[PDB]
């Protein structure tokens, strides 16, 4: 019973960080060879586990979370971070136990003309709880009162990333997979 780790890093389509997707992986045998035989993971950080002694970990479930963010936003995929991505899109718990992988995907997620298909939530009332997910799209107003943009204190809460093939390394798109271990 082979684990679908390959498929997760494999996927042609990745979701926006506000609508990040999770794959439950259980009752299977794990093959982490994709992590080491593909030397492009610019980010490979682990917490409470060892990146290299990784299959000696007997899990009930692993959770794989996939999404896209720009490079300068990758640092917020870590426990105890703050910022718009970590507070309104994807929040790790303080005792997160697993690894975080990320790799530059400019050749497939950026274009010459601009790729505005990936969005993040930049406005919200509360901060997210760890592993919480908010896919609503109600116009944001400081007062909680229904409104309609453009208007008195009123904005749509999602904003587009603009991915161009030809910008600074920190503005290029990065695919992120978060591996969570039970």
């Amino acid at each position: 019973n082979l684990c679908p780790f390959g498929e997760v890093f494999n996927a042609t389509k990745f979701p926006s960080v506000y609508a990040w997707e999770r794959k439950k992986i259980s009752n299977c045998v794990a093959d982490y060879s994709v992590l080491y035989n593909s030397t492009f993971f610019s980010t490979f950080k682990c917490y409470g586990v060892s990146a290299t002694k990784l299959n000696d970990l007997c899990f009930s479930n692993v959770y794989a979370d996939s999404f896209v963010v720009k490079g300068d936003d990758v640092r917020q995929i870590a426990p105890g971070q703050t910022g718009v991505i970590a507070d309104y899109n994807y929040k790790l718990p303080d005792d997160f136990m697993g690894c975080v992988l990320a790799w530059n995907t400019r050749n497939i997620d950026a274009t010459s003309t601009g790729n505005y298909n990936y969005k993040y939530r930049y406005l919200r009332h509360g901060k997210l709880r760890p592993f919480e997910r908010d896919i609503s799209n109600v116009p944001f107003s400081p007062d909680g009162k229904p409104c309609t943009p453009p208007a008195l204190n009123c904005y749509w809460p999602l904003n587009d990333y603009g991915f161009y093939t030809t910008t600074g390394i920190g503005y290029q798109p990065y695919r992120v997979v978060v591996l969570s271990f039970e």
Partner: antibody
Amino acid sequence: QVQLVESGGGVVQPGRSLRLSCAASGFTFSNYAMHWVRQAPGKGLEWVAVISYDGSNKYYADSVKGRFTISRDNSKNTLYLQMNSLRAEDTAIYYCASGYTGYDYFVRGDYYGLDVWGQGTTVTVSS
Amino acid sequence: QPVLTQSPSASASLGASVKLTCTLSSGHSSYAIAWHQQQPEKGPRYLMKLNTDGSHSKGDGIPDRFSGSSSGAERYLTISSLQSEDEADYYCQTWGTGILVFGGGTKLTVLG
């Protein structure tokens, strides 16, 4: 908001012992790697030791191997540095530090991040 | 184990900019590094990790006047619109096998 506060520094005679401590608050201490770094008065920073999240892997700077011993009590969120057979060249400020545990393709194994620094504690070794 | 070569001192006038340089020994040409700042009378502070492809990961609270770039066996810390507080020792640091390596450091004096 994370904080690392060291204790146990002071004056001892060469050839004696001393246990430094490092109190960690504000993060899941038992999941991060932990360092010791020291600075001799007017010298640069010199890395001393690192210990992995579970205490099963320890590495030491050449100049302290055989004498120093790094350990941790995860139940108390505390990091330790046992110094033995102290020398006058062990006079320095000693900081602890924390980091993530990453995989490095150029080493083909673990590297230990150092991304949060402590405040320091001073150790003076003199006859 | 790798060795890091920083120039022992550098200076520029307040409001100017500098590019601190750290060079990896040839055998570890592609190793990633980190930058640390030590202001006078203070402990160190983590700036950013800097990869071989030019990509950086800043710590939280690090101003945008600090950027990292990368070339060959060299690593650069760049500080724009220099302020009085940026006068400090800047240590680049790298990893070996288990062990970590610092450089000598660079005292940056901002003539202000």
